[PDB]
From Swiss-Prot, chain B:
This is Inner capsid protein VP3. The chain holds residues 671 to 720 of 1214 of the full protein. It is found in: Virion. Belongs to the turreted BTV-fold inner capsid family. It comes from the Viruses. It comes from Aquareovirus C (isolate Golden shiner/USA/GSRV/1977) (AQRV-C). Coiled coil: none annotated. Homodecamer; each decamer is made up of two conformers of VP2, called VP2A and VP2B. 12 homodecamers assemble to form an icosahedral capsid. Interacts with VP6. Inner capsid protein that self-assembles to form an icosahedral capsid with a T=2 symmetry, which consists of 120 copies of VP2, with channels at each of its five-fold vertices. This capsid constitutes the innermost concentric layer of the viral mature particle.
Length: 49, 50
């Protein structure tokens, strides 16, 4: 792989790692609440293992 | 106090002879240091990776 492209690839990968996305926070703190509430609403209760 | 005014920058009395651009005024100093800082920012590792 020519280094110019190689330099580009590590660059774009770095950019992805720097995006200030909200999803990871939502998974850890907010999504569980939504599940906990909706569990009482669906016609079929949750079934886990 | 009466007959006085405040001023955000340092000030001097009016010059005597012809004017010319200078480089020791407060604003000029503020400009130079600001530029110097950002240049340092651009060369920081964070920029180099991308």
């Amino acid at each position: 792989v020519n280094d110019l492209t190689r330099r580009t690839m590590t660059g774009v990968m770095t950019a992805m790692r720097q995006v200030k996305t909200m999803t990871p926070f939502y998974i850890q703190h907010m999504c569980p609440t939504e599940l906990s509430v909706l569990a009482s609403v669906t016609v079929t209760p949750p079934f886990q293992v | 106090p009466p007959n006085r005014m405040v001023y955000p920058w340092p000030n001097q009395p009016l010059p005597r002879l012809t004017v010319a651009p200078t480089y020791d005024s407060a604003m000029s100093n503020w400009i130079s240091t600001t530029i110097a800082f950002f240049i340092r920012v651009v060369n920081s590792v964070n920029m180099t990776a991308t």
